[PDB]
Design a protein around this ligand. Structure first.
Ligand SMILES: Nc1ncnc2c1ncn2[C@@H]1O[C@H](CSCC[C@H](N)C(=O)O)[C@@H](O)[C@H]1O
Ligand SMILES: Cc1ncccc1-c1cc(O)c2nc[nH]c(=O)c2c1
Ligand SMILES: [Cl-]
Ligand SMILES: [Mg+2]
Length: 213
């Protein structure tokens, strides 16, 4: 088996079906005690939780699903009727994420989109019936953060007040994205210093609120 299959099995055997918090705790435990994995983690996750509660977004887009940790984390805080779309290029991980969501009982709130973000983003309006996004969580691959931000704007998916929340802006680091949003009059940016998941290594989230053209 893979690490990702081992994480899912650990949740299935150490969490309670229908209890998102137990799912997050099981993943955290496994990845602290057994095998590190690139989930956003509890330290940065607590910052995400505070942001989701502040904005109560109706429609969230996540870029990069992995095993579903962040999708569980966000979807558990959504209001009835609110929705999350999560894009995942690796089909093995999409299959893990679906099973994780099902186990957590959050499958009604979350849709997996299979493919590369750069291919799926241009389909969101016509194929997926999206108007604009309330929040975007960028956590796929560092070199896609800036191009996909620009693509979201081109496609008409951002509105005044859309919240972009980007993981890993320190480690691995996203210097072109940070320089761009922090220099742009079209974003209002805040940095939330934290720690790399499961490690005593500094990292951070960036929040960049879109202002309009
Ligand atoms: N262009 C792209 N589009 C979609 N998914 C991508 C991508 N490039 C990488 N990925 C996916 O992005 C993921 C990064 S890890 C995501 C972790 C998750 N947000 C969490 O916190 O639980 C991987 O599963 C990888 O396959
Ligand atoms: C894998 C890794 N090694 C050392 C340091 C950091 C990482 C790391 C951590 C993350 O949170 C990631 N999130 C999304 N996508 C990634 O590529 C990614 C990589
Ligand atoms: Cl952590
Ligand atoms: Mg990350």
């Amino acid at each position: 088996d893979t690490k990702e299959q081992r994480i899912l099995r650990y949740v299935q055997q150490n969490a309670k079906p229908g209890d998102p918090q137990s799912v997050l705790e099981a993943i955290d435990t496994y990845c602290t005690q057994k095998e590190w994995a690139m989930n956003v983690g509890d330290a940065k996750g607590q910052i995400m939780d505070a942001v989701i509660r502040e904005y109560s977004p109706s429609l969230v887009l996540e870029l990069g699903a992995y095993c579903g940790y962040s999708a569980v984390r966000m979807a558990r805080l959504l209001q009835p009727g609110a929705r999350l779309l999560t894009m995942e290029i690796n089909p093995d991980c999409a299959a893990i994420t679906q099973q994780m969501l099902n186990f957590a009982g959050l499958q009604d709130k979350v849709t997996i989109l299979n493919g590369a973000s750069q291919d799926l983003i241009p389909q969101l309006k016509k194929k997926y019936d999206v108007d604009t996004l309330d929040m975007v969580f960028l956590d796929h691959w560092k070199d896609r953060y800036l191009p996909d931000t620009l693509l979201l704007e081109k496609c008409g998916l951002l509105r005044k007040g859309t919240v972009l929340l980007a993981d890993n802006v320190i480690v691995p680091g996203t210097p072109d994205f940070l320089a761009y949003v922090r220099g742009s009059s079209s974003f209002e940016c805040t940095h939330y210093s934290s720690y790399l998941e499961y490690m005593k290594v500094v990292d951070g989230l960036e929040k960049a609120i879109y202002q309009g053209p």
